[PDB]
Symmetry: D2
């Protein structure tokens, strides 16, 4: 009765996508693939430092593990092209390893027998990059490989859309104060990709770092292509992040109240709105893709010239996951 999903890469995004799917009828994870044994997989599903204990029940069985009575098959195959996808009748592969972030590379799941692939990151190649409730409408059903964009792109897109539609975006710059992730080192050490900053002890530093979110926003919102750029500061929280966006607008005597109200009007399941003076732990586990913070809006006016700054929270884990899973469900139903 259900769309058959396989999760490639049972990592933070992979396991949290598994949890979200439990809460979404019509979708079923029938297989999981990673580089480890069932014991570890089952254990990291039950127990989660920031996101809390898994609510149901998990036991290691023969082909894999059993979750709330349902069997999930598991695999330990680093080369996606060799996975038993045709055999298991996979509708969509959720690509969450970080190693298949390209159309041509992801094509391996298709050869292996899956109908479609949704990648949990920005991907190179000829494919659509989708932020749910910003541009998922651009999917027609004939896509075989699709990108879910990044946590940061999902935090930013709905914000940038409102700024542009309601005020006219001229240009802007972005900083995300971002929680540290699995690709930072625990202690100062060689970094696999040669990045001298990601090399550094993650939980002991403010670490400047690059991100394509603002540069590659034009893939989600074409009419503002090339008008945004920026970076990240990785800081010592384990999850939870904040996007600051500083912009020049066409409209002229813009106020705090006008920007805030425009944001509230656009609010939905993916784009939240708050006036509470919250902090990063308050968003851990939240399912908005972006939580716009009216307490942080600022307008600098000197004569007729204005800079407008806004800020939106996101749980780079669960917020991205909730968006990814919504896009999965929409993609599957075409």
């Amino acid at each position: 009765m259900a769309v058959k999903v396989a999760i490639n890469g049972f990592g933070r995004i992979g396991r949290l996508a598994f949890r979200r799917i439990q809460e979404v009828e019509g979708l079923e994870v029938v297989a999981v693939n990673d580089l480890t044994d069932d014991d570890m997989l089952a254990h990291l599903l039950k127990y989660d430092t920031m996101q809390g204990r898994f609510t149901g029940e998990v036991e290691v069985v023969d082909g894999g593990f059993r979750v709330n009575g349902k069997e999930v098959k598991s695999f330990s195959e680093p080369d996606a092209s060799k996975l038993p996808w045709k055999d298991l009748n996979i509708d969509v592969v959720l690509e969450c390893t970080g190693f298949y972030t390209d159309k041509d590379k992801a094509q391996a799941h298709i050869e292996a027998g899956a109908k479609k692939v949704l990648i949990s990151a920005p991907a190179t190649g000829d494919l659509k990059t989708i932020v749910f409730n910003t541009n998922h409408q651009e999917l027609d059903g004939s896509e075989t490989v699709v990108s879910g964009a990044s946590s940061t792109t999902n935090s930013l897109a709905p914000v940038a859309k409102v700024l542009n539609d309601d005020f006219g975006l001229v240009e802007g710059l972005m900083t995300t104060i971002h929680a540290y992730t699995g690709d930072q080192n625990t202690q100062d050490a060689p970094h696999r990709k040669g990045d001298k900053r990601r090399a550094r002890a993650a939980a002991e530093n403010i670490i400047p770092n690059s991100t394509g979110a603002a540069k590659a926003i034009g893939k989600v919102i074409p009419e503002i292509d090339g008008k945004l750029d920026g970076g990240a500061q990785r800081v010592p929280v384990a999850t939870g992040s904040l996007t600051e966006l500083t912009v020049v607008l066409e409209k002229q005597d813009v106020t705090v109240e006008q920007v805030n109200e425009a944001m509230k009007n656009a609010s939905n399941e993916s784009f939240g709105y708050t006036e509470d003076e919250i902090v990063s732990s308050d968003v851990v586990g939240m399912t908005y893709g972006s939580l716009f913070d009216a307490t942080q809006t600022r307008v600098m006016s000197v004569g007729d010239r204005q800079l407008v700054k806004v800020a939106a929270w996101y749980d780079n884990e669960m917020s991205y996951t909730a968006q990814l899973v919504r896009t999965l469900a929409y993609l599957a139903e075409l």
Copy 2:
């Protein structure tokens, strides 16, 4: 002939001031006042979590404690007007309690017999706010109460001065990714000043917060008064901070290379320059008031319209202290 200094408030800034002063001939700390016993004071001078073990030798004696043979008298008097300053012949009080951040209030150290008061923070009232090597030249020696501004003002002033002198500052917005400080709570709890953000567990959160640095920059650099504003995100590192500044300039085809070179030309003892991909812990204990990071410069250009972003590191503790003590020496020598 040594300048006699009393330190009011043997806290982070006060103890580090003491340490710096050991390295500057012509200055001598003769007394220290706080709310605690000698044992605690000596102990917190010897041992320092972020700044390391005190290099010299410290032992508790009768009137206070003895540092490398020299006696320091200590007091436990919360009412500054009751301190034996006239008796000890104090030239300058370094006011570091956080409770006398006002000209009229700080006047109490004068009544008590000190010649001058230097306040380790922004201060209200009719006084000069001094960032060394930006506007210390404004001191004429007739001042009795002076502000050394904030760690953030010191990180920003030299950057804003260059931007304005070389390019013409129209407007800008600031964000400091800032280490947590002693006025944040360890755990979520009522906050003394009623700030619902500073109330939250300091080491577990990205905490938005206000700062007057950018707004009160016009006190250090009058020709850009009212052209900057911004705030802070307090994050979980124990010291070390970064100021990001996003600006609109009058000059028109501005490049990364031009902005970077202009900063390098202004470098000195207070304003450092780096091209290394450093992170926050790399600036702990440094003595530049501001370390400009060329790796972080960005120029957004859409048609003829540009935004320019730059960033400068500072150890909110030691950088500010090194500036404070430079201003102290200069103020005393007039």
Copy 3:
């Protein structure tokens, strides 16, 4: 009907006790007293760094705040003897301020009009110290002031009981690897109680510290009075803790299997048992007073002489709170 509860001190234990009480029929919080405004109180109930967002709905109203339709009155009176307890018909005051940890002092709630006082810490004076499901049976209903003991006493008591009942306890030593609490400083600073270790940056240090739990265990379990002692290492996690107990027994050829089985047999609502390789974050928010961890049991045998070590987890916040509220319910129903 409902037992009327007032909470004195709406801090970590106070707010979590409020939360627990929402889930326990027959109990109702009708008043709350602290040193802050309603805005702050409401806000700290909604938002909680380690414990998560309050599930219901909270709004500031006239006399205090409204939680899920029910009105809670709030007060800002530091002197308990002046609280309107007689007026509000208070059955039990939950004493959670940390400032009335003595029978004579807590007597102030009684004069003010409350029938009974339950203190959320160890307390001096002529009173019973109660760990639920170890010695709550010692309450007869004529008590007016009772102590709920400490988070550590609650972690230890059920473990010590089994060891003594099943094996004969000769002597032991204890260490709790304990999350940092609100009475530790954010940065190195004078400590109010003069403790040179609690003075130190909480989230940056392993900090040895005292605790009476093991020494004052004989108040909960008289038959082993004087046979235990030990201390704490406060470490940088915001909540969640682990007690290690090393003991000499009378019984002779003791095994890991015998100790673990004996603990399983004693398990209930208050004393959990696990064989999973969990870590501290997994116990955040848990409601057992003590979670025995079988994976950590060790027996050292040299000839006929044995040391036995065991370890039990506890969320120093929620685990203590669940125990406190169980004891409150039992105390009230007599």
Copy 4:
């Protein structure tokens, strides 16, 4: 004249060994091997999060990098047997990768041309395990592969030796509250060795874990073989650690003062002694292999039966390094 050292694995122990060797005449590092480029290597030697900026000057050159005028050749060869050791005339390889912790495996450096190998961890096979100033005297000069033991063994040995020599060791149990290391994950994720605890976010958890230090102590002190065991709690500090040891002694009316005095009498360059109430950050960068903390001694006495507990600090990085390099110097000079 100078002993020629190659460092295999330019990691935390490898780079700090490099730093220590700068301070020790008669040793020279002439080559370094790792899995990364020179740019990374030089960069991680200049900047160190916990240990501070490298004091000298480092530049990337042709064959590797230049440190204070001296050339160090660098290699990127994961298979030790293929390194140019015979060609560079290597006297001792410092084995610091974590992958050659066995006599037979390490034998690859010897084939490659090195005369001797010192391994920076416990190692399996027929070799001596050496804690400097406890059993380095056991080296005769004919050894080709030697283990420098672990940081924990180095913290424990000199303590255990005094306890046994002066009191008679019957049995004991150990816990090290230990800083997190580079083999812990930044976020909950599959762990390469299948350890479900080491899999967990390092900087957010108290993580129980095994260590052979106490079990394999009999390799360093054979007369107490089989008398000690225990484990670790990994906690969120980035370096700095504490060993707690609980013991039963033959000597009967043992006091705190007797134990502390006995420790003081054994103090030297490897075994320090303190009566100050220090915390973990106070030992970062220290060069004692073990710092005995008299403030933490405890004696539980019930009738004639006593438990004795003691505690010694160590910087698991710099302490182990200082010991390792002392053993390297001694080994080389035979």
